[PDB]
Enzyme design. Structure first.
Site, short mmCIF file in Angstrom:
data_model
loop_
_atom_site.label_atom_id
_atom_site.label_comp_id
_atom_site.label_asym_id
_atom_site.label_seq_id
_atom_site.Cartn_x
_atom_site.Cartn_y
_atom_site.Cartn_z
N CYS A 1 0.85 -1.17 0.00
CA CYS A 1 0.00 0.00 0.00
C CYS A 1 0.90 1.22 0.00
CB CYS A 1 -0.89 0.00 1.24
SG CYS A 1 -1.92 -1.50 1.34
N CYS B 1 -4.05 0.21 -2.63
CA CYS B 1 -4.50 0.46 -1.26
C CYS B 1 -3.70 1.59 -0.64
CB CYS B 1 -4.38 -0.81 -0.41
SG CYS B 1 -2.77 -1.66 -0.51
#
Length: 222
Positions: free
Chosen positions: A71, A143
């Site tokens: 992420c 993400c």
């Protein structure tokens, strides 16, 4: 056709690249099998009408080459193409296919080196569908905080017809991505043709605010 013919030694090339990726680029994935991948890639288009490509033809390939990046590490570059951070070309699949050309032919058990239909010849050609799908997946698996680099030297840094503006931005999952940061690059050599205060970037912002996803834009020379 109007597009580039298949890259010579296409098979050998993707086989090599794949290994170099799982043993060096991201040892993290040395558990994957390159020959299996190469087979899937090739099986997806070989001996098929070069204008009949469908996303589905790559299921097997997208399954054997899937990889979710860290992420906050997902980065996008839109028409500015010309560390420890993942852009589509730094992933396994984007890595081996990068810069290559491919397409099959009905009745042929090999690639067509002569020519391949490009997007304007037919949208459903095997190179475009591939890249179109890879981008979609890459955006869906993003993400945390995502980034996108745009070119401040052109009138409209954010293009609604580019892969990023028509595909990627819309495939970002609000439930996984909370912020998108845009960087508009400027050359100390010339004045900005487009800036963070332009209507182009505002088009991007509205897309993001529609999904309550936070957005920020900054300008950099570098």
């Amino acid at each position: 056709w109007n597009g580039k013919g298949s890259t010579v030694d296409f098979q050998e090339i993707i086989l090599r690249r794949c290994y170099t990726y799982i043993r060096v680029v991201q040892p993290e994935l040395g558990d994957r099998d390159c020959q299996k991948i190469k087979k899937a890639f090739t099986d997806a288009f070989i001996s098929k009408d070069p204008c009949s490509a469908r996303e589905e033809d790559y299921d097997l390939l997208m399954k054997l080459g899937h990889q979710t990046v860290p992420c906050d590490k997902t980065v996008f570059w839109s028409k500015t193409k010309e560390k420890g951070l993942f852009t589509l070309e730094n992933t396994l699949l984007g890595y081996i296919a990068d810069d290559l050309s491919w397409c099959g032919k009905v009745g042929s058990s090999e690639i067509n080196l002569e020519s391949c239909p490009d997007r304007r010849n037919c949208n459903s050609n095997f190179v475009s569908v591939f890249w179109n799908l890879l981008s979609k997946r890459f955006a869906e698996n993003a993400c945390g905080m995502v980034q996108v680099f745009l070119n401040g030297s052109i009138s409209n840094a954010f293009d609604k017809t580019s892969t990023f503006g028509r595909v990627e931005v819309h495939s970002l999952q609000p439930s996984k991505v909370h912020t998108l940061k845009a960087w508009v690059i400027h050359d100390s050599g010339k004045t900005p043709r487009d800036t963070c205060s332009g209507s182009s970037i505002n088009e991007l912002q509205l897309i993001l605010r529609g999904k309550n996803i936070k957005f920020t834009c900054q300008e950099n020379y570098r």
